[PDB]
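pasting input
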Amino acid sequence: TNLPTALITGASSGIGATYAERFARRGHNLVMVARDKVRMDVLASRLREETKVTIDVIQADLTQQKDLAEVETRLREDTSIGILINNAGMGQSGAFVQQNAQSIDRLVMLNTTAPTRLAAAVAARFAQEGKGSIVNIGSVVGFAPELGMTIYGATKAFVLFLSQGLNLELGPKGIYVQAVLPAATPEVMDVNELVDAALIGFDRKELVTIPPLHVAERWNELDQARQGLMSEIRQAHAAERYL
Amino acid sequence: TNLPTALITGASSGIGATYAERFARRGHNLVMVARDKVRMDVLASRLREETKVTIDVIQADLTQQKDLAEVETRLREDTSIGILINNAGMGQSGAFVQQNAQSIDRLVMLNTTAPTRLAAAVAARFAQEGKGSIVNIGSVVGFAPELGMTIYGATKAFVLFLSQGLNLELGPKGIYVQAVLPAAPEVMDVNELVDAALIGFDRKELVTIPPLHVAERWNELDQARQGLMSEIRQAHAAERYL
């Protein structure tokens, strides 16, 4: 059976690097995309020797239009790429009043605009072939505006909604769209634990995978509450409490 | 002084124009920001005659870095502006496979990056003065990925989270942050929607959803959200993942 090549963003460290290591050991060829080329080459050299798979290393600053369009083109034309890992370690630096226009641009671009454009690059080809996987790395911060990471959490709420919408749109076409929601990473989770758990959901083709969530029912309750709100949407007139 | 000036984006038609009309009749001076200068000038000329308030008209394509930076600068330096209406009529054209990189750029910029940057322009000054209002125009589509407007609804889910986070961050400093969520075949009158949103604005309501028939549904949804975070145990993966 064909094991498809996986393109992974932010593949130089953290979740991206661990995803590259796991897929290489599984037998997948890789396309590693990251701004930090030095760490990518170190990791790629080790994975080539250990796993004998093919690894192409692309240096790219996805806040650049030039670099992002080049990665988009690779996803569109490389028919061997059947897996896209939308990963970005880009977080928010402190409070909202400390953000400047430039850091907001980069934060939204890396966590929202770039993942959406990459999914659009493979969506048309995945629909042609009737197969493919899009794994979007969100965060549980998208559920918690109380944590004080306002812009970052907002981009993660974006990524979750994007995954839910892409599933309903691309699912019937044979495309698997997964949302992975790591914890804010006071002992936190090991990155090996996190990615191994995310892959257990990937193999089950789970749509929303939240490794740090103790009660899986909590998600379904939130989804039910969401759909329960939409059942009371009557667009003809405003509610009486506003009259 | 007295009634603070309100800056309104997308003020050329729809919700933005209706907001401009309501605030002008209330006695607020306006700063109207929109790409369509012709419709802004028609509306501004009439509102000047009817309401005698001051209206400054700024033509701005908020997908341009130059134009957006100018509106940010005006928000930082004009101390009379005490109200920001983050409004954008920008929607999505059909399905996701039909979206191109350029339309995605503009959709996210107008509905996500620009409102966030405009709020950042007033946040520091509003905290200085200890007062001010930020009204973010979201949508109920942010609750419904089933409607097939994936990117648009995603930007609106962004806007809702931004409002909730800005409330908890800027609220204690005296800043009011409101999220207004209009609906997406009989639709609602735009006058009803803005009149309903302003009823919540005067109550300083944090989340105003005019088309929501049962207000409790929102509180239940927010409770369900917090219930999920209460079961987040970050030390180890859940047992269901080995």
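fyi Chain B touches chain A through 85 residues (CB under 8 Å).
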